[PDB]
Amino acid sequence: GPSVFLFPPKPKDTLMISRTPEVTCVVVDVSHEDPEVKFNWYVDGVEVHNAKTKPREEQYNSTYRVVSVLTVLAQDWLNGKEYKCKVSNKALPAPIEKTISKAKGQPREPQVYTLPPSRDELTKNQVSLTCLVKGFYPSDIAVEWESNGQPENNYKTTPPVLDSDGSFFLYSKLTVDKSRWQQGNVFSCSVMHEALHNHYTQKSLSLS
Amino acid sequence: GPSVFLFPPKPKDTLMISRTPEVTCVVVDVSHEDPEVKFNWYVDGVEVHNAKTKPREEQYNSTYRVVSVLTVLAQDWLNGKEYKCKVSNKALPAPIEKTISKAKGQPREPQVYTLPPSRDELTKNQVSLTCLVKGFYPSDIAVEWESNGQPENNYKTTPPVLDSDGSFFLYSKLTVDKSRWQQGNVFSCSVMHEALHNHYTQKSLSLS
Ligand SMILES: *[C@@H]1O[C@H](CO[C@@H]2O[C@@H](C)[C@@H](O)[C@@H](O)[C@@H]2O)[C@@H](O[C@@H]2O[C@H](CO)[C@@H](O[C@@H]3O[C@H](CO[C@H]4O[C@H](CO)[C@@H](O)[C@H](O)[C@@H]4O[C@@H]4O[C@H](CO)[C@@H](O)[C@H](O)[C@H]4NC(C)=O)[C@@H](O)[C@H](O[C@H]4O[C@H](CO)[C@@H](O)[C@H](O)[C@@H]4O[C@@H]4O[C@H](CO)[C@@H](O)[C@H](O)[C@H]4NC(C)=O)[C@@H]3O)[C@H](O)[C@H]2NC(C)=O)[C@H](O)[C@H]1NC(C)=O
Ligand SMILES: *[C@@H]1O[C@H](CO[C@@H]2O[C@@H](C)[C@@H](O)[C@@H](O)[C@@H]2O)[C@@H](O[C@@H]2O[C@H](CO)[C@@H](O[C@@H]3O[C@H](CO[C@H]4O[C@H](CO)[C@@H](O)[C@H](O)[C@@H]4O[C@@H]4O[C@H](CO)[C@@H](O)[C@H](O)[C@H]4NC(C)=O)[C@@H](O)[C@H](O[C@H]4O[C@H](CO)[C@@H](O)[C@H](O)[C@@H]4O[C@@H]4O[C@H](CO)[C@@H](O)[C@H](O)[C@H]4NC(C)=O)[C@@H]3O)[C@H](O)[C@H]2NC(C)=O)[C@H](O)[C@H]1NC(C)=O
DSSP: OOEEEEEOOOHHHHSSTTOOOEEEEEEEOOOTTSOOOOEEEEETTEEOOOOOEEEEEEOSSSOEEEEEEEEOOHHHHHTTOOEEEEEOOSSSSSOEEEOOOOOOSOOBOOEEEEEOOOGGGGGSSEEEEEEEEEEEBSSOOEEEEEETTEEOSSEEEOOOEEOTTSOEEEEEEEEEEHHHHHHSOOEEEEEEOTTSGGGEEEEEEOOO | OOEEEEEOOOHHHHSSTTOOOEEEEEEEOOOTTSOOEEEEEEETTEEEOOOOEEEEEEOSSSOEEEEEEEEOOHHHHHTTOOEEEEEEESSSSSOEEEOOOOOOSOOBOOEEEEEOOOGGGGGSSEEEEEEEEEEEBSSOOEEEEEETTEEOSSEEEOOOEEOTTSOEEEEEEEEEEHHHHHHSOOEEEEEEOTTSGGGEEEEEEOOO
């Protein structure tokens, strides 16, 4: 048979003014001769109807893949509303409810430190810039790098890791031409998280 | 019905002289009235019999959980031998083969930089020490921290992240009493990876 998966809004969507955060009910594994599902959504059990079943797109496993999407208020998600996606299907002898909400636990304000490349790393053509972002709850957050109010292309962020004190940390690495870090050039780590002021801070980092 | 999961040896096991690296065939979801499985193992298809079905231990889902374990040569794994765990079960109308070997691709020697805590982090009681370990392949690796030839207890390592250039990176964070980092005290990041010399390097980091 099948199995149902539920996914939460994106950090940036819920912590930014004019975005469109949404929850995404992914039904995977559907049998051809019975490929019709049926979604009924609920916010805190209260049945809401901003549904959006995006018609049934195809796959490889000789099976199938139906998906709904429910737009939702940012302050809704942040205030811990529960979002029950109720799948009703013919081929199943029972629906498959799957609830999910924000993570409860006390929010925690991330500390952000930016870290210059190790003296040794100069021997290369491109150098690494490190953003440490520790001690935060819940795990949802969003990191980004820029310079001159312009995004940077070459950075990659580790996913959050459960720290020893039940909070999270993570690093985001930025890579640049060694020439740039030298000169004087200034670069910024931007973090977006619940527990932050205006949900947003930004630490710079450069050369002395 | 069920589903089968296969897991590879641990990094340290295969890159260290006298360890006992093993592959672990985890059969999850077993029916009570038909809870008997059968494993037949193969190294590169050649059937080997260092099997080890650890009798069937229990669970919660009103289902079931049978497991085998096959010891194996370190240089075997590192040389890309393929390890087919063949599950034969009654309740299934077909076995469930699941192959897995080392990751193919050209091994790549990790660069290791250690990073002191950001000037601002001194306002706290405990300080963070960073190990950057980048540009390596395959993803298997093992990090560890110590001081005075003694392990440290408070560190946590991110899992490897796919970098832009098809290699991996990761950081390992070590936490210490601010008092220690000060003094003069020296700390070491220890890395164990295929592409390394003797499969092992270790960079130190301290105060000037
Ligand atoms: C054949 O049918 C389908 C078709 O899939 C096709 O074949 C497979 C093999 C792949 O090659 C596909 O590329 C290909 O299209 C197969 O369907 C798959 O089914 C498996 C399970 O049977 C699913 O694995 C799950 O993955 C989720 C999260 O995965 C995201 O990223 C995956 C890529 O790695 C991607 O596959 C998923 O679609 C999903 O996609 C994400 O979608 C959102 C949309 O906005 C996006 O933001 C993401 O970026 C996007 N990612 C991508 C790349 O698309 C994983 O979380 C599930 O496991 C969780 O839950 C399990 C318990 O239910 C638990 O055991 C796990 O440990 C894990 O637990 C989670 O842990 C963390 C907390 O730290 C957190 O993630 C969760 O909160 C927590 N969950 C819970 C509730 O505990 C799960 O493993 C795939 O989703 C699915 N593939 C696709 C594309 O849907 C299927 O394999 C075949 N049929 C079979 C079984 O024979
Ligand atoms: C009855 O209960 C048990 C309890 O399990 C869980 O318990 C509760 C608390 C919740 O978390 C529930 O989500 C869940 O019920 C269920 O047993 C579970 O079975 C599910 C699905 O059958 C498993 O999900 C998979 O997890 C594996 C990894 O599992 C390791 O790590 C887990 C968390 O980190 C841990 O819980 C496991 O114990 C296990 O631990 C490892 O064990 C070995 C043994 O020695 C050890 O050596 C390792 O060191 C150790 N790992 C460590 C360090 O933690 C994961 O691999 C699977 O994800 C891949 O496959 C999915 C297939 O569905 C796919 O959806 C994913 O996207 C993902 O994709 C893979 O990507 C890799 C990339 O390299 C690739 O190699 C694979 O080919 C590819 N696989 C694909 C696509 O198929 C998967 O998420 C649970 O782990 C397992 N739980 C336990 C306790 O074992 C059981 O299902 C329940 N009955 C039901 C629901 O019917």
